[PDB]
Design a protein around this ligand. Structure first.
Ligand SMILES: C[C@H](NC(=O)[C@H](CC(=O)NCC(C)(C)C)NC(=O)c1ccc(C(=O)NO)cc1)C(=O)NCc1ccccc1
Ligand SMILES: [K+]
Ligand SMILES: [K+]
Ligand SMILES: [Zn+2]
Length: 356
């Protein structure tokens, strides 16, 4: 069994012209890549080439107007780049942003293709800018195009329209864009765990609550696991996976698993305030590998402590390669509010999933 890896240094060119120290740094992906080399993980993987997504591929999820506007940023003057960035919630743009976003999506397309055609069993994509806040018609939260959602649609386009795709989003923030793109869809099961705080955490919408279960034929195929009341870690994520993510995922029986793998719930993250450990992320990865004949693609989203994300994603790759899961700490008892959250989600999703 072969693990694939895609990384292209050109995705470092997207940058914040107003604040060179903004945490969504080019060095996020180069530090992760260097750690894969130091831990001798990189040489164990099949190297998947990056490529640009095409505009027809972007149109699987995004409107013609959104694609055109972001594409035009490649040729804008600084004053226009500044004005364009201000037309979105939490976006900075440079002349290289569009190309980097194309590279991030196209890299994931090549990895999903490699997985689905049997060239590799599973794969990891070290990409930026991230994707899961991007909506059909707008950029948001450092995301221009929704890489994970696009990869699900691309995978369906090269197999069959009904290919069952699971997206697990363990970035600390809700993937509002991914939820909305698939809200009415029963072919793509979206499961997000995220810091919620009764709506007082980015992206600041009640769409992230546990009672948003999907719409129409998609009812039951949107699973929000919202955390409230302080710092969650390995015990809470392991419990949510044990009682919610994996039972629902097994009943759905995905043919492809995409992980929106932000590492901003990691211990040490300056923005997330949580303390999932690298061993925790290894155990989450190892559980997902029991799905979909092992067809798992791990896609970088957020995560802003350079050392934490480098250790955390390297631990995921080590699991994909088949290494034994590392020992976890003594798991402290579940925090009270996490028990509440799990009970709320179970109650909301019991109508739809007999295994609950
Ligand atoms: C005030 C509020 N602030 C933000 O939205 C900050 C903006 C920023 O960059 N701050 C610098 C900092 C990151 C160092 C804190 N963004 C995030 O906190 C953030 C963090 C992580 C991810 C992510 O993707 N993780 O994976 C996405 C977004 C803001 O702008 N309102 C403007 C508005 C306009 C229009 C409507 C509503 C609102
Ligand atoms: K999430
Ligand atoms: K869905
Ligand atoms: Zn995030």
């Amino acid at each position: 069994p072969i693990t694939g890896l895609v990384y292209d240094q050109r995705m470092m060119l997207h940058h914040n012209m107003w604040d060179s120290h903004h945490p969504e740094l080019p060095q996020r992906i180069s530090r992760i890549f260097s750690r894969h080399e130091e831990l001798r993980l990189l040489s164990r993987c099949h190297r998947i080439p990056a490529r640009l997504a095409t505009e027809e591929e972007l149109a699987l999820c995004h409107s013609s107007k959104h694609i055109s506007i972001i594409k035009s940023s490649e040729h804008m003057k600084p004053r226009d780049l500044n004005r364009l960035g201000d037309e979105y919630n939490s976006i900075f743009i440079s002349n290289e942003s569009y190309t980097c976003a194309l590279l991030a999506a196209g890299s994931c397309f090549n990895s999903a293709q490699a997985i689905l055609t049997g060239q590799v069993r599973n794969a990891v994509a070290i990409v930026r800018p991230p994707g899961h806040h991007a909506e059909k018609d707008t950029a948001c939260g450092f995301c221009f195009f929704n890489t994970a959602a696009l990869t699900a649609r691309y995978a369906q386009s090269i197999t069959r329209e009904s290919l069952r795709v699971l997206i697990v989003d363990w970035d600390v923030h809700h993937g509002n864009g991914t939820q909305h793109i698939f809200e009415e869809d029963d072919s793509v099961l979206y499961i997000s765990l995220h810091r919620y705080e009764d709506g007082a955490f980015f992206p600041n919408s009640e769409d992230a609550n546990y009672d948003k279960v999907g719409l129409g034929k998609g009812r039951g195929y949107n699973v929000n696991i919202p955390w409230n009341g302080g710092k969650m870690g390995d015990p809470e994520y392991m419990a949510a996976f044990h009682h919610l993510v994996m039972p629902i995922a097994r009943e759905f029986a995905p043919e492809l698993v995409l992980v929106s793998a932000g590492f901003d719930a990691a211990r040490g993250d300056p923005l997330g305030g949580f303390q999932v450990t690298p061993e925790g992320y290894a155990h989450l990865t190892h559980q997902l590998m029991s799905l979909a004949a092992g067809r798992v693609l791990i896609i970088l989203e957020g995560g802003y402590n350079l050392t934490s994300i480098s250790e955390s994603m390297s631990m995921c790759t080590s699991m994909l390669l088949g290494d034994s899961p590392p020992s976890l700490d003594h798991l402290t008892p579940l925090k009270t509010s996490a028990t509440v959250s799990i009970n709320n989600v179970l109650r909301a999703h019991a109508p739809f999933w007999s295994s609950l």
